[PDB]
Every structure is written in C-alpha cells, then in structure tokens.
Design an enzyme around this catalytic site. Structure first.
Site, PDB file in Angstrom:
ATOM      1  N   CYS A 161       0.760  -1.210   0.000  1.00  0.00           N
ATOM      2  CA  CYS A 161       0.000   0.000   0.000  1.00  0.00           C
ATOM      3  C   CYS A 161       0.810   1.291   0.000  1.00  0.00           C
ATOM      4  O   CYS A 161       0.231   2.340  -0.207  1.00  0.00           O
ATOM      5  CB  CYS A 161      -1.020  -0.107   1.150  1.00  0.00           C
ATOM      6  N   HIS A 296      -2.583   7.050   6.789  1.00  0.00           N
ATOM      7  CA  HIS A 296      -2.737   5.761   6.177  1.00  0.00           C
ATOM      8  C   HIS A 296      -4.104   5.147   6.460  1.00  0.00           C
ATOM      9  O   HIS A 296      -4.723   4.530   5.606  1.00  0.00           O
ATOM     10  CB  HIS A 296      -1.573   4.859   6.676  1.00  0.00           C
ATOM     11  N   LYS A 328      -9.839   7.482   3.148  1.00  0.00           N
ATOM     12  CA  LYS A 328     -10.225   6.131   2.789  1.00  0.00           C
ATOM     13  C   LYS A 328     -11.638   5.789   3.260  1.00  0.00           C
ATOM     14  O   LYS A 328     -12.260   4.887   2.719  1.00  0.00           O
ATOM     15  CB  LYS A 328      -9.265   5.049   3.284  1.00  0.00           C
ATOM     16  N   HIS A 333      -9.632   1.579  -0.110  1.00  0.00           N
ATOM     17  CA  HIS A 333      -8.229   1.393  -0.182  1.00  0.00           C
ATOM     18  C   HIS A 333      -7.838   0.839  -1.562  1.00  0.00           C
ATOM     19  O   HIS A 333      -8.082  -0.316  -1.837  1.00  0.00           O
ATOM     20  CB  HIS A 333      -7.839   0.442   0.919  1.00  0.00           C
ATOM     21  N   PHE A 391       1.412   3.142   4.419  1.00  0.00           N
ATOM     22  CA  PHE A 391       2.209   2.079   4.963  1.00  0.00           C
ATOM     23  C   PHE A 391       1.760   0.748   4.359  1.00  0.00           C
ATOM     24  O   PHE A 391       0.599   0.576   3.997  1.00  0.00           O
ATOM     25  CB  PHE A 391       2.067   2.074   6.481  1.00  0.00           C
ATOM     26  N   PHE A 393       2.072  -3.735   3.816  1.00  0.00           N
ATOM     27  CA  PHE A 393       2.498  -5.036   4.285  1.00  0.00           C
ATOM     28  C   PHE A 393       3.988  -5.202   4.075  1.00  0.00           C
ATOM     29  O   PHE A 393       4.590  -4.628   3.137  1.00  0.00           O
ATOM     30  CB  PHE A 393       1.764  -6.164   3.527  1.00  0.00           C
TER      31      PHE A 393
HETATM   32  O1  LIG Z   1      -0.426  -9.481  -7.309  1.00  0.00           O
HETATM   33  C1  LIG Z   1      -1.607  -9.546  -6.519  1.00  0.00           C
HETATM   34  C2  LIG Z   1      -1.532  -8.793  -5.201  1.00  0.00           C
HETATM   35  C3  LIG Z   1      -1.477  -7.358  -5.092  1.00  0.00           C
HETATM   36  C4  LIG Z   1      -1.360  -7.151  -3.761  1.00  0.00           C
HETATM   37  C5  LIG Z   1      -1.268  -5.978  -2.943  1.00  0.00           C
HETATM   38  C6  LIG Z   1      -1.446  -4.733  -3.377  1.00  0.00           C
HETATM   39  C7  LIG Z   1      -1.304  -3.769  -2.335  1.00  0.00           C
HETATM   40  C8  LIG Z   1      -1.028  -4.311  -1.153  1.00  0.00           C
HETATM   41  S1  LIG Z   1      -0.920  -6.001  -1.273  1.00  0.00           S
HETATM   42  O2  LIG Z   1      -1.389  -8.348  -3.111  1.00  0.00           O
HETATM   43  N1  LIG Z   1      -1.455  -9.360  -4.045  1.00  0.00           N
HETATM   44 NA    NA Z   2      -2.316   9.186   3.298  1.00  0.00          NA
END
Ligand SMILES: OCc1cc(-c2cccs2)on1
Ligand code: NA
Ligand SMILES: OCc1cc(-c2cccs2)on1
Ligand SMILES: [Cl-]
Ligand SMILES: [Cl-]
Ligand code: NA
Ligand code: NA
Ligand code: NA
Lengths: 407, 407
Positions: A161, A296, A328, A333, A391, A393
């Site tokens: 993100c 965020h 958001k 998101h 922020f 993962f």
């Molecule tokens: O490729 C597929 C996919 C995209 C994402 C994310 C996008 C933004 C945060 S995790 O997680 N899996």
């Molecule tokens: Na922001």
C-alpha cells in the site's frame, strides 16, 4: 539539491473520474463504496468495494489497449489527464530528461488467472501473445513508457500500500539530484475478485456493513471492521522548479519532504516505531507547521491505532496536532493507487481551502478522543503544508510532505 | 558522492546453488538447461527450462516459509548466503542505516492461480490467510525485510528483465547520496508453468531444441530460436567504501557506473538507441577500459542483434571491442533474477581470472562475425572492469559497471 514541484495531476477514483469529480466528492463527503454482487456470488464475507465508474473504451483506443490490464488502462487515462493539466507538448513528454516511475501493488491478477484457465481448457496458444506486459509487475511503467514514448528513467516501484508514495518519492529524488528534469509518478491497481479474494481470505476486509455499503469504510469509528478494497489510478507530473517556472507551469505544490523506512517486525501489522521514523525523516527537511494529515488509516482495528500513536509522539494531541481526516472512509483502499491518490486529494484540498470530513464516524473510538480527527468539513482554511502517510504489508513505510509554493 | 562496494554475494541458479557451484559451471561451460516434462504435458511448444536444484526445506525453516513463494524462498537462501559471505553481525543487518531493494519481474503466479482455483472449488476461506505477501509485487522485499528485521529503506523495483539491475543501481544511488550505508540488493523469480505459459503463448521461448535441452539457449548462434526460461535469485551486499574498509570487508568490486534509460518504442522489441544511451550513461563515470561485457543477449532472433549494434557503436568491432560472452546460453533467462545473477557471474569471473565461453555456438550468426564473442574460455586474464546489460519489455534499459578495487 534542486527544488521539485507538482505541475499536473490525473486521477481515476471510486470518488470520481477526474479531479473535478473527486473535489466534489471530498467536499460533500460522497462515498465511493457500493455492493460487490460478485463477491457475494463467490461466497466472500466482504461484499463491498470502491469501483471506478468510467468508460475505458471511450478514452483509450483499441491499439493503445493491446497491452493494458484494467488497472493500467485507468493509469493511461490518468496520464492523459496529467499531461493535459500540465499543458505539456509532445516534446516535453518524450525526451531524455523526462522519465516515469509508475507502480502497482500487483499486476493484472485477472490476466494471470484467465491465462491459466484458458491454458487448461483450450491450450497454451489460446492465452494469446499479449499477456506478459499485463501480467508483469512493471506493467504500469512499461505500458505508459512505451505508449507515451518516454526516453528517460522507466521502472516500477512496489511496496504494497506504500507503492505510489515510494514512486513519487523516488521520482522526487531523481529530480533533486539532477538526473531528470520531469517525471511522471504514481500508480494504479485493478479491482478484481482474483485480487480481492486474497484479502477476504485473511479476514482483512469489512463484512459487517454489507447491507449499508456506503458506510463500510469508517476509519477511527469504534466499530470499524476492516478495509474496503478499491481500484483506480493517479499520476503527478513533477518538475524541477526552474523548468516549471520557465514554461509558465501551474504549481499545485512543492515536494518538501520524503520519508521511507522499514519496521522489520511483522508482515501484516505495523510496529508504530517505523512510522515515527518515517514521518520524522519526511519532516526533517520541512520548516513550516503541518496544516493537515492524510493518514494511512484503512479502517482496520489493528492499523488505525499505531499510526495515531506515532502521530501523537511527533505532534502531540488535541489542538496543537494538525487536523487528521482519513479519505479512505470515502474512497476505500486502492492499494497501489492509494499514495498518489491521497497526494492528489491533499493537493486539491489545499487548492480549494477546505479539509474534508473523516467520514462515517458514527461513534469515535474512545482511544482517539484526544486527537483532532475532523468530524465535519472545515471551510475557509488556508492550507500551506500537508503530510500524507502510506504504509504497506512487509513493514514498508512512506511519507510525503507537500507545500504551497510562495517562492 | 560516496564510493560504493560489493562486500558479499549469494545466489540460487540453474547453474549452481552457491557461488562455488556457479563458478565451476561457468569454468566448465556446464549447461543448466533440462527438459520440462510438465510443459510437454500442458501442450507447450517450448519444453525446456533452467531449474535450480536446491532443497528449500533444509535451508529455510517452516515458520520462516509462511509468507514465501518459491522465488522469494530462493531469495531468502541467497540473502543468508550474502550475509554469511559478508560476515555481518545481526546489528549490521538490522539498523536504520541498512536497507533492502529486492525485486521480481512478477510475484508468485502460482499463488495467484492456486488461490483462484481453490476459491472456485472449495470456497474463498480455503485460500488461507497468508497469500497476499506471496502474491504482491513487493514480495521479495517485504518477506526479507520482515524476516531479517531491516529498518532502513524497503521496497521492490520491477522492470521485467532489467528488474534486479535497477534494484542494484537504485541501492547504489542510496549509498552514493548518503541516505543508507549498507543495502541488500537483487531479486528473484519463481519458475512455474503459470508464468512460463505466458511466454510460450507469445512464441518467445526456444522450441526447436527440445530433444537436446542442454543446448537450447545459444545466444549468437545462427539458429537460435528464443530464450529459455529459468528461476532463481541473487543478492549483493553493498556498502559505502569507508564502512566496508573499517570493518575489514571483502571487496568483490566497486560499482563505478549505472545507466537507466527508456526506448519509448516497442513493447517487446528493443530499439537499439535506448541501449546506446544506457551504456553511455553507465560509462560516463568510468575511467578505465572495459575488459568484459556480459550482454543482455537472451538467444532471440530480434534481441541479440540490436544490442550487438549498440555495442559496436560505442566500442567498435573486432579486437578493440571488449570480449563478449552471453552467460544466458548456460543459465537461461531468470527474468527478475537475471541482472543480479549476471553481476555475480561477472564478479566471480573477475575474482577467478577467466572469461567463460559464450556457450552453444555451433554456427555463429554471420551478422556477428566481426565481434569478439568468446568461442572458448579465456584463462589467465586479469579483469579490472566489467559491464553488464539487462533490458526488459517495455523498452526499459539498465547497465551496471563494476571495477576491481585497487584504492
Ligand atoms: O499481485 C496480486 C496482489 C497485489 C497485492 C497488494 C497490493 C497492495 C497491497 S498487497 O497483493 N497481491
Ligand atoms: Na495518506
Ligand atoms: O507476474 C507474472 C509475470 C512476470 C513477468 C516477467 C518477468 C520478467 C519479464 S516479464 O511477466 N509476467
Ligand atoms: Cl511475520
Ligand atoms: Cl507496442
Ligand atoms: Na522540521
Ligand atoms: Na568514460
Ligand atoms: Na548482462
């Protein structure tokens, strides 16, 4: 280091198909969240999403679509808007001094799944010959760089993100250090069950508000229950200051700070301390007070709180802390798109002298009762400096600070 | 700007599971390419691949694997190797001055497809809760940053086959400009039918050598017929020079040039002129002659030739041009991993005073008869400066130049 300004913007959002529609949605606290019937049909817990409403075929021609997934098609639209807003000539778009850093949190998962399915049903040839550029992680940069004839820098950053915040910050650096004079920076995300399911399976998305979708995203509400996923795209045109001034550019703001840190802690949950270091890094080059924080805050039990504590650590509580309003709650998101979209929302609020409501707070979480979370739109306010966090993962943190240009 | 050196290396390759095995494969021109029975079963034209041969479960523990796809598991192994090679303490790995830029050309396509399949067969819950970090484009940075407790920079660059060259170059910049003192840089790619099919459907991979897989990858051969796909990973530890010297680091080489450009031309085919600008940008900061070129050359009819013309433009032909040897003839094309792996091969050749054969040239394409393409291993050569190109779909170009440290 050179100074760097934002000279054009483009956006495809759940809350509007251009900057004018987005502004109106922000002013009026108009939610972009609706029921996702398909999610229900597939057995998801979460049955809500933030879907753009835009006619791609009317805005991107067929040959131009050969290598686009839906997310990068939205990004193409946003690029066209940003070029038009900036008033650039073709030569200004396509030259050795002008680059692109454009990302997505994932590629086209729908391309990947459809290809796997058709391989098994009808054979590998039936995948067709145009799937790689849609499926690869660099899709947003590759497609736009090729179509817009970009000659300078060309790559994608991804950081979950944080993606498009890091895209903008790295583009900023490129210009600061004199490697490029103009950059297109931003990102996108498709909206597709093949992506959304990954989050529903983790329990991360809202499911208790399916019967009132518009209010499902509700950062800081006591009864928040997960984020609402969205798709879309955004682009900023960035230029060194002299370049911008000399051509009579519009200046939406100056980039005055950029932080990028790592928690080194948990894959899904933030540590808080990483966010503090990130905001401090962004603020280390900023001399003016912050007038507005675009957090965020994704409407999660575990996410909204550590960021508020990080903000309290740096800014204090109550009136001495900048007003905080989580966009958001209106937009959902949009993953890869969220950083650049939030930059755009913040710049549009700066342009229009208002701070939007932090929507859908029916009962404020008492843990946040000391903080200046915006409960009703604030009008006739002059914003000079705005901060936006994203922020992701993997403990990845990015913060940007933009300032009204006054010399 | 600060000087930046390579202090540790780690690799998982089709030609070896560590740097010693890779060195032996390079010396002996031992191919890493084998038959891909699964591709045949699925009806592919191409039935060859470059598969690592490594026991992941013996090297990465179960909890450590929770968020890894196979490609990022290989990258974890390479990270462990690089840390051990550099002799870093835990404090040296985990601190605010030490970051990670680690990419892949795509995420785990197998995670994405398996999740889609299980959703439809058994329901969304059966995706499980750990798929996002595997499926997201930032997987390589997020997983390693979290597990190794990285506190500084944390994101992924992707740029198709240029991915890990750009990762290294951006990490280099971070150190040059004083933002970080140590970086882990590199990348990875899984090897999986769900990715490979995308390339088979475009006709891009070799299919006329299925009955002699070991010789299918044959850059510069008159009868080359497409690339051979591979998977794997590589990591470099980069440090500012003073940091490295003060701790008694090994110095495998100094990064002395980095080019990054965009063709703005075709999605799949290179223009040539972009490559010339990229190499010139890398060379603009290099004072010594180039002793060896590790080309992009993937064993494609349309790719090998424009790069040779770009090289001729800059270096000339014949003996005055550096020797050229395409390592992909042995290794295949590992996509996200290829840039960092080729940096490692080049540094290992520098360490060991040899240039490998450009393998599997049974009949040299007459178009290249004027160029110093290495037909037999060159021994007892002192290499001081080496150049490596990686170019990707979307017209994205990256070049790195490494030099033997002599003060
Ligand atoms: O490729 C597929 C996919 C995209 C994402 C994310 C996008 C933004 C945060 S995790 O997680 N899996
Ligand atoms: Na922001
Ligand atoms: O996400 C799947 C995927 C990965 C790639 C590429 C990797 C390197 C060059 S293209 O293409 N599709
Ligand atoms: Cl974890
Ligand atoms: Cl094209
Ligand atoms: Na400050
Ligand atoms: Na030079
Ligand atoms: Na190379």
């Amino acid at each position: 280091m050179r100074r760097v300004v934002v000279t054009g913007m483009g956006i495809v959002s759940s809350i509007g198909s251009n900057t004018e529609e987005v502004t109106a949605s922000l002013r009026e606290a108009k939610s972009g969240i609706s029921r996702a019937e398909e999610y229900a049909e597939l057995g998801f817990r979460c049955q809500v999403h933030g879907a753009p409403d835009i006619d791609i075929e009317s805005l991107v021609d067929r040959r131009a679509m050969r290598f686009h997934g839906r997310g990068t098609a939205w990004n193409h639209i946003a690029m066209d808007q940003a070029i038009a807003d900036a008033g650039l000539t073709e030569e200004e778009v396509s030259n050795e001094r002008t680059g692109i850093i454009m990302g997505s949190g994932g590629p086209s998962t729908r391309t990947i799944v459809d290809s796997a399915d058709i391989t098994r049903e009808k054979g590998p040839k039936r995948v067709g010959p145009f799937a790689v550029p849609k499926a690869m992680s660099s899709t947003a940069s590759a497609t736009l760089a090729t179509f817009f004839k970009i000659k300078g820098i060309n790559y994608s950053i991804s950081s979950a993100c944080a993606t498009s915040n890091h895209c903008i910050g790295n583009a900023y650096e490129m210009i600061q250090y004199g490697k490029q004079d103009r950059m297109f920076a931003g990102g996108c995300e498709d909206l597709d069950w093949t992506l959304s399911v990954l989050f529903d399976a983790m329990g991360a998305m809202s499911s208790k508000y399916n019967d009132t979708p518009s209010t499902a995203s509700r950062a800081y509400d006591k009864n928040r229950d997960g984020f609402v996923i969205a798709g879309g795209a955004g682009v900023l045109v960035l230029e060194d200051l002299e370049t911008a001034l000399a051509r009579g550019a519009k200046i939406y703001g100056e980039i005055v700070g950029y932080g990028a840190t790592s928690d080194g802690y948990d894959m899904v949950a933030p540590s808080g301390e990483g966010a503090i270091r990130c905001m401090k890094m962004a603020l280390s080059t900023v001399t003016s007070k912050i007038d507005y924080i675009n957090p965020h805050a994704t409407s999660t039990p575990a996410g909204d709180a550590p960021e508020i504590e990080a903000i309290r650590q740096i800014f204090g509580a109550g009136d001495v802390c900048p007003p905080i309003a989580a966009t958001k709650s209106l937009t959902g998101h949009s993953l890869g798109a969220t950083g650049v979209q939030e930059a755009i929302y913040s710049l549009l609020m700066m342009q229009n002298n208002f701070i939007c409501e932090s929507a859908h707070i029916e009962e404020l979480d008492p843990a946040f009762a000391d903080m200046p979370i915006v409960r009703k739109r604030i009008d006739n306010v002059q914003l000079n400096t705005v901060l936006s966090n994203s922020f992701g993962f993997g403990g990845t943190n990015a913060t940007l600070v933009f300032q009204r240009y006054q010399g």
